[PDB]
Amino acid sequence: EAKGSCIEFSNWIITRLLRIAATPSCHLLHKKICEVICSLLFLFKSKSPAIFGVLTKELLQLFEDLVYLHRRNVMGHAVEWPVVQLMSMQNLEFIEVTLLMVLTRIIAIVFFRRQELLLWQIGCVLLEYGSPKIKSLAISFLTELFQLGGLPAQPASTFFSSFLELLKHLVEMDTDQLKLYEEPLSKLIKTLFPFEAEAYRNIEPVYLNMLLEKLCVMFEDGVLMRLKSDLLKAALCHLLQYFLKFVPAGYESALQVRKVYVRNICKALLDVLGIYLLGPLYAALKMESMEIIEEIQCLWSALKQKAESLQISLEYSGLKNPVIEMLEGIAVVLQLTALCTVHCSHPSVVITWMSLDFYTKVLKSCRSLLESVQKLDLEATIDKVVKIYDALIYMQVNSSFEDHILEDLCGMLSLPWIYSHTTFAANLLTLSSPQAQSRCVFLLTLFPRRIFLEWRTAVYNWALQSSHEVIRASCVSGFFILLQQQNSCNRVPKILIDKVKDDSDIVKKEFASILGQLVCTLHGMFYLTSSLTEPFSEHGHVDLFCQHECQLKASVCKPFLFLLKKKIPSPVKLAFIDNLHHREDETDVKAVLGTLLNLMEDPDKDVRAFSGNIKHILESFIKELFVLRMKEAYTHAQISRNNELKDTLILTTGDIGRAAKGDLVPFALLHLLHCLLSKSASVSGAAYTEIRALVAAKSVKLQSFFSQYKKPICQFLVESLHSSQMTALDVAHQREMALNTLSEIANVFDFPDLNRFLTRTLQVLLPDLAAKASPAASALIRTLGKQLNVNRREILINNFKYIFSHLVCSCSKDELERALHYLKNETEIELGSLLRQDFQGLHNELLLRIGEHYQQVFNGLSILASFASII
């Protein structure tokens, strides 16, 4: 049509575009053209959903033409000289790859159903057709399509075959080809395998059998042993972690028979090993050890023999052990600590961990090897040896093998440091990074008291003496860990925290860990171990191996609570909120309220960090004053007139209402309801979501809960309506708009008909409106009666007996008599004898107030005698 004619103008441009598609600088231009094509597809989507669909069909036809070209390439037989002037398949492939990159974004936009698995299969065929980088670019687009599509049923075996082809490529991959190959596409395949079972359990056993063939490829093949790109080697280790470590399903698979093959694959996997990815393999080996654990309970020796071979290289010479091999021997020492008795704990401990003393003899040889190493030797390798010493400390775990060995380790830790922080003592230090210093500080922190307890205090003094970068974060951790008894005692950390309240960001994170010991976690320390049950920290280096189990004043927190600030970067409370995030506080409560007020202010709206922690604080007067400060902050947000600031306050208000059982939080919800009444968006829609979150915390009965929720709070809501009634400002239409706002409140009540909910509310409201006795409210009540189109003034006489009970329920004394006179002007002749005729249940309602009515109920009885004609 006319749009087609515009497309035809584009087609004339397209013949020019094909020359643009292949050029030296064309690929950068083609990427811009592909973005323009994606924009054109977006523009087609903007012009019509159908126009995007027509464009998608044209794109599908272009994809089909590319698939036919791919099929000819897959055939490898006849090639058209021209596929449109002169066509080059490599030039066409580059143009196709640019089209594919726009297409992959378009395909995600298209979200085609039942017309995409074939395209994914075509992409897998295109990847098989593709060679090197062109295949890798296709694979990356396919991986993005796969992530959106999960696994196509249509790709079926061919997708498994493509994974098998990738495994074949892995078996024989050039390093340049590996550089061409995309780690992220490999990572996406690793991502596709589940960490546990999940999708991998969903994934076919035959696909798992293809994975077993993939397991035969690479390390079982020894292709992994053959030199590989480190990212590719990491990806292969990640893939083994993704599937082999996961061991998802596998009931169909050989399982324990496969595991013996897997153990043979694991021996192939260790490959060179020490003589990283090996650490990931060690984590997989630790997972295999974990699999051996419990299953062994109603192998490890072979692993010990492999360790013994690494030890034998160290034994022949310090030089003979590879530094990587020395690191490999150190690696899994923590896993060995986890294995046997720690594994038995989580019993018999029949399995035995490798002896620390044999390791210590290797460590003594390693200390000799470090002395043996030349200044060019060791250095960063010595830092790896220090990391190996740190691994030995992790292996020592709760108990050092010997106090003297711990003293030797402390001397080894001192190496670079002189004084502060061992028969060799200073001379060993004389014979001998900030991160290395931090690792030494961590190791000094890890030892507690026992041998060289004064040296550990000296090490804490050394941590005070140097606090730079990681060492400063380590120093804050060290001071807390320097004495378990000091940890049990409560004292200001001071030190760097005294020098700067933040003490710098790295110290602040360490302070947050100290904060984790502080507050809900008991100040007294039992075990005092942060090790917990660490698994593998992603690609991160393991680094450190690491009342509750036994009521803390904010004033007791003192400066650390003061140190957290809106000015402080924070983002977020994180570890510092800690257990407290998971009383007669008095001035400490006021200090806590100030910290809460800073949280209520929220330096970052996203960090409001406050949520959940506030609920724990709610679980944990001054809080009402903090709520008043929060209301002032809400007023400040209205003064700010910033939607994001208003939203953060609304979110905090919503969290608070769910967080607190107490009425003041419900009153805050009523304030939120006043916010819900306010215009400019958010407001009630945000409030309704907040109300639903409060309702979920409430486990509310709806209207029965609402009557408990409302009552005086409904009267306060009515008072807010009365404030609107007081200044309705469109004449009857403005009153109707106020009625519509009341109708919205009835809709918020959502009981039966909103008008029916309103009618039940109205009888209570009419007494409340009478109690306010505003002339504007009286006009609003007449408008409300017109909106009701009900009994109106006749209803008001029925309302008046309830209103008289409301007047009995709240008494303004002489002001109430003036209000009664205002009510009397609305009343005109009034109940008169009929009030004497009634009373009864309305009098009973005054009786129901009882002691709260107090003298006023007796006065009401005297008033009833006056109405009739009881002091």
Place this chain on the structure above:
Amino acid sequence: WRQRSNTQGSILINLLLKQPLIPGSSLSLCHLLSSLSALREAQNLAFTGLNLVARNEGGRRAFPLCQLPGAVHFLPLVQFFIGLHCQALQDLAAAKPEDSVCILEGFSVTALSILQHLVCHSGAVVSLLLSGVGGQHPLLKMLLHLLAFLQASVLTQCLKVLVKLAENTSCDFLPRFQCVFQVLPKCLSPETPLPSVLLAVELLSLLADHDQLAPQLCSHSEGCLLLLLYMYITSRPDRVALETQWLQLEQEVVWLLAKLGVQSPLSNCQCNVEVVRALTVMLHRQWLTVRRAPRTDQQRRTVRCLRDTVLLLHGLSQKDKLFMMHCVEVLHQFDQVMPGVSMLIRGLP
């Protein structure tokens, strides 16, 4: 294709060999596989056909699919096994022990579902289904009656098999297949499982490609089949669906909506009223995402789904001149949806 296609046919045979490839079954084929003597002869023929499938390998073709005469022969043998499952369904239809016979039929249905996966794997088995009794396969027509009559999971597998068949089927063949779904939509229930409903939604996307289902329209409201299905979708009780799986069923509905949006052809329509309710349900999901404020892959998928939902909402506003009239029913949700849209804009990066 060629030997690699034969290997793919062998892999489908290997899945049949694997015990059981179908979920919830200890064993597939073999003892589970096995006149009764004629059926045993058919099972031997199917094994020969599986050996033959190992020996030998446009839009309806889709991705090229290996075709094996032995796989088609296995499919006829599978049809005899399906007929025994159908006979239990026919006995149930006659009825106005049997559950154990139904369990045996269910194992046969699971084998038929494995056969359906094999049919997705093999073009010739799909072609035999495409030819049908004369159209729908006579065993497949009995299976469609069985689907109308665990058993719900088998029906979901049959719906998934039908969706796979529809992709294999030519659009005209798919149109002949189409309207089986309209009877199926009546069979589909809120009480019937959401995972089964999600399979039905996948079948509905295959149906949307089919011309007869495309002829079926949201307009005509409850009387229209599409609108009634949308109204069930609008309720979104999803009692069977949990967490991501409930989101995945919504995402599948969003993908089906996207397919309708792609099509040029796609109150008066229950589905248009349902779409405002569905947008509100999407807004409730968006509000949960706003409460979440994508490190999890499911969270990343949800964020993409939320972006898709926002595009569908933009499409719905474009679709209806009275966006506000739809909005007024969903207006409390719409104010939350506008906050969610701002969160989605914040989410977009």
